[PDB]
Amino acid sequence: AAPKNRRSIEVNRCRRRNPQKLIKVKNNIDVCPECGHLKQKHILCGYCXXXXXXXXXXXXXXXXXXXX
Amino acid sequence: GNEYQPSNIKRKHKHGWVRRLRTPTGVQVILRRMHKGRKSLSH
Amino acid sequence: SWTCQQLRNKSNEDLHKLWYVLLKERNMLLTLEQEAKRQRLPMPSPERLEKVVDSMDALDKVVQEREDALRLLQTG
Amino acid sequence: XXXXXXXXXXXXXXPEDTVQFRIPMEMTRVDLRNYLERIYNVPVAAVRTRVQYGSNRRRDHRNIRIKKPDYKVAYVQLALGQXXXXX
RNA sequence: UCGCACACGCUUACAUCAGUAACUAAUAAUAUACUGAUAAUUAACAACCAAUAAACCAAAACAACACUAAAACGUUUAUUAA
RNA sequence: ACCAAAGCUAGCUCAACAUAAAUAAAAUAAAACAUUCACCUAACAUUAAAGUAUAGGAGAUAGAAAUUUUUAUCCUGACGCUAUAGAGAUAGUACCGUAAGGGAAAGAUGAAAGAAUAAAAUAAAAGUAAAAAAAAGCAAAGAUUACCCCUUCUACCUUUUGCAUAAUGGUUUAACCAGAAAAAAUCUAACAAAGAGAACUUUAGCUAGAUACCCCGAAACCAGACGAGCUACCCAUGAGCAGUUUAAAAGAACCAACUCAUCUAUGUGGCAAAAUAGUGAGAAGACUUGUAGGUAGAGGUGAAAA
Ligand SMILES: [Zn+2]
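ok -> structure tokens follow
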């Protein structure tokens, strides 16, 4: 099918703004119990964990290379 | 498919410069091409 | 100037024994030039190279015009 | 001016009696041998020549496709007892 | 699962290094298919070459043979010459 | 304030001067068409003869000749135009087509980068800023509040007897874009039985000036050439077509490659301007295919379907 007529500005605004509610803002922000950095709720920190996971990955690769 | 089957030998023989020289009408073709200021008399 | 200085001095053998040496020198000089440019390194001595180019063109023009003079002399 | 030398450019390793050169396209191997023998005073055992077609590049200002000048390269084998090393 | 070599062709796409806000591969990852600069293998491989004049009958089908549709390419001798 | 307009300069048109051969048509006009047709191909100066003598389906129209009159150079530009105008041209390039051929778009800071001097920031488009109390609206006006509800009204244009019409055209904005011919006449002036710059008219004429007759569009015709790298046929030279049952059988039938496209489904601005999946035919023959060639439009080819 094809549009009968061109859309007015008002209809476009009312359609693209109100019903979609834009982006609903909740609070995901929580302070890390360890380093005190701001991170997401119900989730592990992105500071004191990713570095320890990379150090654990390097230690696992070094142990796997030393065992072989 | 397509109507085009590229060949260099056929192109150089048929559309070539020597072929244009062998016929007076071809000389007229080169003539009008040089009159139009074509940079290439042959593709 | 330099061209005229070459033309006023008349030697048949010495000329080739000169500009062939300068040409074979330009060969190695432009060789080092090309090897420098293709090595992704700046030109160590562009000035001397340009001077060698201009001088080689000059001497080649001298030999050319001298040969032209000789041929014109033998023709007429 | 017609010829030049290239050593550290080629990735192929042939330090023993093998030298690489850029030559003119019209010059035959024999004339190259004689020229290299008489002018630079060195013996030449063999000559192997090949033609390198020039790469092309466009120009956006005039909207015109252009091509770099074609080249020809040669590989000379000299007399025994010589080693070519250059940077 | 279906593809490696020979081409007619196709006119540096490719290999290395460097840089990717931007364009370029409908995005990212990145890059054999982006920018910039710099590398681009030989030959006994493939193209390019003797003039003529004579001799001879009974096809090819892993073919003594047979059949039909009455037979892609083949050799020898002599002269001149490079 | 955002995409944006606005600020200059190349560039050219035209006039003048200098310097291996051989009757082309047709569309069209005569509102059909058939004799006919200013014109165009090359030579062809002014005034007057003259739109006359003649010619012509005596239709349209075509149209002289005899004869007449004429004149020395030196003195250059614009009441022509600017990026939609003037050449297409910062170029016959990029790009398209096998080819002949067709043919574009494209620059601005300042005296000096010495890179923050400028001066407006208003064209169509969304951001600074959405509809708002149980209300109807070809989109406004009269009232009313610094906003709105209520009351009063059937878009424009084109085509038509008649359209808000469910007849036509338009997304919006900018820009571009389609009435240029004086005979007789009316009128303003010169002179007057004469006017008018050696040419014509004339019982108030004659001379000069000023007033009315716009564009786009075919299907086709003719001429000169380009096209058999698609496809149709053919010439020359090469290559290809497992396996199984079998009485001698390149012999029969089945069945992979390859060559075809029976049926169904999917796909329907697509994977694709002829497809994919399943299935089906030929598959030693009138078979398939590579390369090198030949045949074209007052035709060729065609196991023949216009
Ligand atoms: Zn943490």
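The beta strands of chain D are 4-5, 18-23, 44-52, 56-59, 64-67, 71-78.
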